[PDB]
Design a binder for this molecule. Structure first.
Ligand SMILES: CC(=O)N[C@H](C(=O)N[C@@H](Cc1ccccc1)C[C@H](O)[C@H](Cc1ccccc1)NC(=O)[C@@H]1CN(c2cccc(C(C)=O)c2)C(=O)O1)C(C)C
Lengths: 99, 99
């Protein structure tokens, strides 16, 4: 599809049995999801943005479906205010910026 | 142009005769530039990000040329880690997400 930017580019994603709304975010290197209790190994990490840093849990090779496009990659879990789909997954679903 | 997302979508912008690199950021409501001098009045404002809130200076009706496309809009100036072009200006240059 084509998504205009008049409003936040929010889309439905699927991860496990949780459907969620997430921002398609070209300004995020990494995908960062609201707190959720995913299974498996993870490692602690700190990610920074406007305002400072937050502590997250890095989970690897997690399947996520974004608007019915399949992806699989690293997902950071922590106290983000908004679910963020970052470039690591945006490339996998063939997302570009165009003007 | 079409811009893929294997790298950060950084572009040269021109503002007040100065060239800067800035991030095309669909996950940002607002345009936020690192500390710099801009002419005219500004209003103190606060904005929030992944790590918390910061204080910025709001400049209205500021021309920025982004990849040779003209915008004139609100530009916030403050302690952002990177220069960010947000949706307020991305829409002005006809930018969309496509996959
Ligand atoms: C309300 C709003 O739109 N806030 C924006 C914002 O912070 N947007 C965030 C997501 C968000 C958070 C809270 C509320 C709403 C929306 C997403 C941005 O794309 C943001 C841009 C950015 C990029 C780099 C540094 C600071 C800010 N992205 C991120 O926060 C993360 C941080 N990040 C990153 C990666 C590596 C190093 C660093 C450093 C050194 O700070 C940051 C990254 O790639 O994406 C501002 C930029 C205006």
């Amino acid at each position: 599809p084509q998504i205009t930017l008049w409003k936040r580019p929010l889309v439905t994603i699927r991860i496990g049995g949780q459907l969620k709304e997430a921002l398609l975010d070209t300004g995020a290197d990494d995908t960062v999801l609201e707190e959720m209790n995913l299974p498996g190994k993870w490692k602690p990490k700190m990610i920074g943005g406007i305002g400072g840093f937050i502590k997250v849990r890095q989970y690897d090779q997690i399947p996520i479906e974004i608007c019915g496009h399949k992806a699989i990659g690293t997902v950071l879990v922590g106290p983000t205010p908004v679910n963020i789909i970052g470039r690591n997954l945006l490339t996998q679903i063939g997302c570009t910026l165009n003007f």
